[PDB]
C-alpha cells in the first residue's frame, strides 16, 4: 500500500572533523519476505555520495538518472559536480515529478573539493532540502535513527570515532525495525580517501 | 529590379503593395453601389446589370444584413463580398455574445478592417477584390463606412464605389453642400435611386435593376430593411423622371 514500506531499508549520514560518513542496511524484501541481502543503497558520482531509501525500483531508477545527469554535467562543466550543486540537482529533479513522485528518501554526503568543507543533506519525496550540520536519517527506521543520532552524536568526531558512532546508530535502529537489517555498509569520507566497511549484524 | 507585384505582402521600392492595388482594379471594374448617411440612419443602393431576360427579376439580391442593424453592399468580386459578410456576421455574434449589446458600427468597422488588412500581410493569401459600403444605427447615431481592399476605411457622409463611382461621388458632393442640415431617410431613398440611375450611364449599354435598403431610427426602428413595393417604385420614378 505504502510504496515506502514495501521494500524497507535505512540510510544515515553524519559529519565529523574534516570528514563525513554515510551508511545503509542491505535488506531488500517484499513485505515480510526477505529477498536480497546485498541491496546497497549508497552510490556516488565522482566524490559526491548519495544514499536512497524507499521503493527499490525508484531507488534504482534515480541512481541511473543521476549517473546520466552528472555525466553530461562533467562533460559540459569540465569538472566534477560538488555536494552543494548536486543537492540542488536532486531537489529540482524530484519536484519535476511533484504530482507523480518517486517514492524515495534521498541523502547526500561529501566534502567540497574546493573548500574542503563537510556536507550532508536530506530530501523528502518531492525535493524539499534538509541541510543539517550534524546528521540526516532516512528509511523505515527513521524514528529509531533519530533517537540513536540525537543521543549518540557529538561534533567534530575524528574519522575513527565517527565510524563507531554512525555504526552503532544504524545497527541499533535497524534491530528495532522489521523491514531493515540483513547486513550494513558504512562509508567514511575524507578529502583524500574513502573507506568502505561491511558491518556484522543480526540476520533475522 | 522588378517582380515586386507578383507576391502579396511585398513592399515595392516606393513603399506600395501592388497586389492590393491590382485588387482595386477588380473593384473599379465592378457594378456601382453607394451609401447615403441621413439625419437618423443610412441608405444603401446598388446597380444590378440585367445580363439577360432569363434572370428572374428581383431575385438575385445583393445587399446584405449583418446582425439585425447593419447593412452591407459592395462592388468587385461578389464572392469575396459574401466571404467578408460571413466574417462580419461571426464577428458580430461573438461581440453580442460576450457584451450582450449588439455591436456598435464603429467597432464592427474595425473588425472588418483588421480582417481585410490581415490579407495584406502574407503572400499565402490574396487581398479582397471588393470595396464595401456598410453602416447602421447604434447607441449614438447612424454611421456610414467604406472599406478598401487595403483594409483602409473611414466614416463617410456619402460613399460610392465601382464603375460609376465618379458620377455618384459627384452627385453625393452636391447633396452634401446643399443640405448642411442633413438629408432625411425618406429623401435619401429617392436621392439614392437617382445617383444610381445617373451613375448607370457609365454602363448605359446593359439594362439593370435597382436595389435599395435602409436603416433609420424612425422609419425602421434602427433595424435594417429592404425597400420594397410602393416606396421602391416611388423612388424609381423620382429617378426615371429626373434622368430627363
Amino acid at each position: 500500500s505504502d510504496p515506502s514500506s514495501i521494500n524497507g531499508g535505512i540510510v544515515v549520514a553524519m559529519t565529523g572533523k574534516d570528514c563525513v560518513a554515510i551508511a545503509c542496511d542491505l535488506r531488500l524484501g517484499s513485505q515480510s519476505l526477505g529477498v536480497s541481502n546485498k541491496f546497497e543503497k549508497i552510490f556516488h558520482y565522482g566524490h559526491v555520495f548519495l544514499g536512497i531509501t524507499g521503493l527499490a525500483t525508484d531507488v534504482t531508477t534515480l541512481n541511473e538518472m543521476f549517473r546520466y545527469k552528472t555525466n553530461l554535467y562533467k562533460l559540459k562543466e569540465e569538472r566534477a559536480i560538488e555536494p552543494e550543486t548536486f543537492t540542488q540537482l536532486v531537489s529540482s529533479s524530484l519536484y519535476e515529478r511533484r504530482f507523480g513522485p518517486y517514492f524515495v528518501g534521498p541523502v547526500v554526503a561529501g566534502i567540497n573539493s574546493k573548500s574542503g568543507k563537510p556536507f550532508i543533506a536530506g530530501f523528502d519525496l518531492i525535493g524539499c532540502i534538509d541541510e543539517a550540520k550534524d546528521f540526516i536519517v532516512s528509511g523505515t527506521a527513521s524514528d529509531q535513527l533519530f533517537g540513536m543520532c540525537e543521543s549518540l552524536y557529538e561534533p567534530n568526531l575524528e574519522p575513527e570515532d565517527l565510524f563507531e558512532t554512525i555504526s552503532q546508530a544504524l545497527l541499533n535502529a535497524a534491530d528495532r525495525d522489521a523491514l531493515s537489517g540483513w547486513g550494513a555498509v558504512v562509508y567514511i569520507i575524507k578529502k583524500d580517501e574513502v573507506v568502505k566497511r561491511y558491518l556484522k549484524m543480526r540476520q533475522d | 529590379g522588378t517582380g515586386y507585384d507578383l507576391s502579396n505582402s511585398v513592399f515595392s521600392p516606393d513603399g506600395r503593395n501592388f497586389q492590393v492595388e491590382y485588387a482595386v482594379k477588380a473593384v473599379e471594374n465592378g457594378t456601382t453601389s453607394i451609401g447615403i448617411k441621413c439625419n437618423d440612419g443610412v441608405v444603401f443602393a446598388v446597380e444590378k446589370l440585367i445580363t439577360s431576360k432569363l434572370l428572374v427579376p428581383q431575385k438575385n439580391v445583393k445587399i446584405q444584413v449583418v446582425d439585425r442593424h447593419i447593412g452591407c453592399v459592395y462592388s468587385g468580386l461578389i464572392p469575396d463580398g459574401r466571404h467578408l459578410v460571413n466574417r462580419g456576421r461571426e464577428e458580430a455574434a461573438s461581440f453580442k455574445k460576450l457584451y450582450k449589446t449588439p455591436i456598435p458600427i464603429p467597432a464592427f468597422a474595425d473588425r472588418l478592417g483588421q480582417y481585410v488588412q490581415a490579407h495584406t500581410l502574407y503572400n499565402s493569401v490574396r487581398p479582397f477584390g471588393v470595396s464595401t459600403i456598410f453602416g447602421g444605427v447604434d447607441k449614438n447615431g447612424a454611421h456610414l463606412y467604406m472599406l478598401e481592399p487595403s483594409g483602409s476605411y473611414w466614416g463617410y457622409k456619402g460613399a460610392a464605389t465601382g464603375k460609376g463611382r465618379q458620377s455618384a461621388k459627384a452627385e453625393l458632393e452636391k447633396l452634401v453642400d446643399h443640405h448642411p442640415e442633413g438629408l432625411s431617410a425618406r429623401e435619401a431613398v429617392k436621392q439614392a435611386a437617382k445617383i444610381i440611375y445617373l451613375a448607370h450611364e457609365d454602363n448605359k449599354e446593359k439594362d439593370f435593376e435597382l436595389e435599395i435598403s435602409w436603416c433609420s431610427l424612425s422609419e425602421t426602428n434602427g433595424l435594417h430593411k429592404f425597400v420594397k413595393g410602393d416606396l421602391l417604385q416611388e423612388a424609381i420614378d423620382f429617378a426615371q423622371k429626373e434622368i430627363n
Binding site: - | 513592399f11 478592417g113 500581410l121 456619402g158
Partner: protein, 243 residues
C-alpha cells in the same frame, strides 16, 4: 538571388531592402507630427488632412488611446496603424492583468519594437510600414516619448518629430533646446505646452493652421486625452495674440 529584395533576408551588402521600403511607406500619408515634454505633461501635435468632402472628419485620425495612460500617434497607412494600435491595446491590457500595474510607455514601446524586429527576421511576416510614437507621464520616469520603426529600433526622446518634413521640425526643436539649455518646455500648464508645440510646428513648416488642420493629444499624470476642434481653436487664438 534577386529575391533578397522581396523577403527579409540579407542583401550582399548586409541590408534588408524590405525594411527600407517599409520605411518609405511611412511617409505615404504625407503627414508630419511632433512631441514635446512639459514640466508634467507630454504633448503630441499632428497634421490632420481631410481631402474628400464626402468624409466624416471626426473619423480621420492617426492618434490613438492605447490605455488610460498611454497615447500613440502613427506615421503611415491607416490599415497598418490600426493593426499596431489594436495590438498595443491588447498588450497593455494584458500587462496590467499579469503584473498588477500599468504598462509603462517605454516598456510597451520595447514590446512593440521586438514584435517589429520579428517581421525583420521571419520571412512570412512583412514589416508594418509605420513609425509609432508613444507618450505619457510615466509614474516613474515622468513625461515620456518613445518611438519605434519598421527596423524594430526604439529609443526615448526629449522631443521628436516624424513625417516628410521631419528634418525641419527636428532642427527647429534642436535649436530651441540648445538655447533654453533644458530638455523640456518649462511650463506648468499643458495648454501652454500645446501652444509651444503648435507654434514651432508652424515655424518649421512655414504654415498657418486652422482648428481642423491639426490633431492634438495630451498626456498627464494618470491620463492621456486628445483635444477637440474647439479645444484646439482656443489654443490657436491664444498663440495669435502674441504674434
Amino acid at each position: 538571388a534577386g529575391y533578397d529584395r522581396h523577403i527579409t533576408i540579407f542583401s550582399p551588402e548586409g541590408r534588408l531592402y524590405q525594411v527600407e521600403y517599409a520605411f518609405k511607406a511611412t511617409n505615404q500619408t504625407n503627414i508630419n507630427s511632433l512631441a514635446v515634454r512639459g514640466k508634467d505633461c507630454t504633448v503630441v501635435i499632428s497634421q490632420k488632412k481631410v481631402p474628400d468632402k464626402l468624409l466624416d472628419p471626426t473619423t480621420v485620425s492617426y492618434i490613438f488611446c492605447i490605455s488610460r495612460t498611454i497615447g500613440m500617434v502613427v506615421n503611415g497607412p491607416i490599415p497598418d496603424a490600426r493593426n499596431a494600435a489594436l495590438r498595443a491595446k491588447a498588450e497593455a491590457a494584458e500587462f496590467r492583468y499579469k503584473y498588477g500595474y500599468d504598462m509603462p510607455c517605454d516598456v510597451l514601446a520595447k514590446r512593440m519594437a521586438n514584435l517589429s524586429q520579428i517581421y525583420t527576421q521571419r520571412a512570412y511576416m512583412r514589416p508594418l510600414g509605420v513609425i509609432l510614437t508613444f507618450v505619457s507621464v510615466d509614474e516613474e520616469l515622468g513625461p515620456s516619448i518613445y518611438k519605434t520603426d519598421p527596423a524594430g529600433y526604439y529609443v526615448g526622446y526629449k522631443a521628436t518629430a516624424t513625417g516628410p518634413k521631419q528634418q525641419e521640425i527636428t532642427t527647429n526643436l534642436e535649436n530651441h533646446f540648445k538655447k533654453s539649455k533644458i530638455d523640456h518646455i518649462n511650463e506648468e500648464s499643458w495648454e501652454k505646452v500645446v501652444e509651444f508645440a503648435i507654434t514651432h510646428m508652424i515655424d518649421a513648416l512655414g504654415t498657418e493652421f486652422s482648428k481642423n488642420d491639426l490633431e492634438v493629444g495630451v498626456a498627464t499624470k494618470d491620463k492621456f486625452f486628445t483635444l477637440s476642434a474647439e479645444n484646439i481653436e482656443e489654443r490657436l487664438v491664444a498663440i495669435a495674440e502674441q504674434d
